[PDB]
Amino acid sequence: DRSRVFDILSNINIGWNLGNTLDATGGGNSVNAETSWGNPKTTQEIVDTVNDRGFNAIRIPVTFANHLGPAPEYTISADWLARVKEVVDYAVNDGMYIILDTHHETNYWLKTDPNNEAALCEELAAIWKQLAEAFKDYDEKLMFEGMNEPRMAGSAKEWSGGTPAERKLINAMNKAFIDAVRATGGNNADRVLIICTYGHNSDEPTLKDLEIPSDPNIAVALHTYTPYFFTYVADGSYSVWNGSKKNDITWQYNNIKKYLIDKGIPVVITETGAQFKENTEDIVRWIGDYVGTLDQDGVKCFIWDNNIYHGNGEKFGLLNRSLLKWYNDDIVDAYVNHA
Ligand SMILES: OC[C@H]1O[C@@H](O)[C@H](O)[C@@H](O)[C@@H]1O
Ligand SMILES: [Mg+2]
């Protein structure tokens, strides 16, 4: 029975990622990392704005690598941990649901080499031990997500679920994460812990090899910017949504039902969204087909938002953080009013 997790998740309307912020990897071992990718320092006001609009759940991606001491302690620099707590505290002050993760560790130490299983498991656990300790008293609305898109950068199957050997390693790393957090006790004994697949990939071979922990207070995170060629800019990509490609979403979703939902396993889409391609009416139609598919079984999602809309980059921005106004209210309405 995993129904405690379903109840907590059912309270979520829809989620929102504080992208390109604490996950940013500039600034070295300094709090300035937060602003290194061009975003302003996060404020209570910014989180309020997100909450007020209808995003009552927030994902806080964080890259710790450059703020860690040497092995084996990997002590998180006091200043950084304090700042991460401040930003989490903004959401807590608004009674929001929260995901805290480790993010671009994949740029540094989190390279999924099966020959290096021990060093990977131990660093992950050492980091999560310190995080769990820091947030020991935080209530059940705070959730932990162990890893973000864990993979080997540059490998052939980086974005197609990796190799079968790597998928075993991900299962070991999931257990290490869970094991480390539960051992801190307090509210972490039954806190919702979100595990993931290799690269957060949701292909059938990826899901088939996913080992499910017996721990009843866990959920499976996936990333589904589906279809890729609508959501991202690339050779072959498009900005029109008429519903002819809805089959891609449904076909993928049926596999998720096959391997997780219909086995009573809680599932969360911790990242999704569509880059703005001057196609407001199309994105609104995609949201209806994509989010409406998730709503069939009450699966929740968190929208990726990096604060990029006008300038260069992946245009996942929705909230203009400097003005506290939304870049595109038609798209945002479709999200918050999905039910
Ligand atoms: O896992 C989700 C992802 O889909 C991939 O196809 C993209 O190349 C990645 O940039 C993205 O993070
Ligand atoms: Mg308790």
UniProtKB/TrEMBL annotation:
Its EC number is 3.2.1.151. It comes from the Bacteria. Keywords: Glycosidase, Hydrolase. This is Xyloglucan-specific endo-beta-1,4-glucanase. It comes from uncultured bacterium. The lineage of its organism: Bacteria, environmental samples. The chain holds residues 92 to 430 of 431 of the full protein.
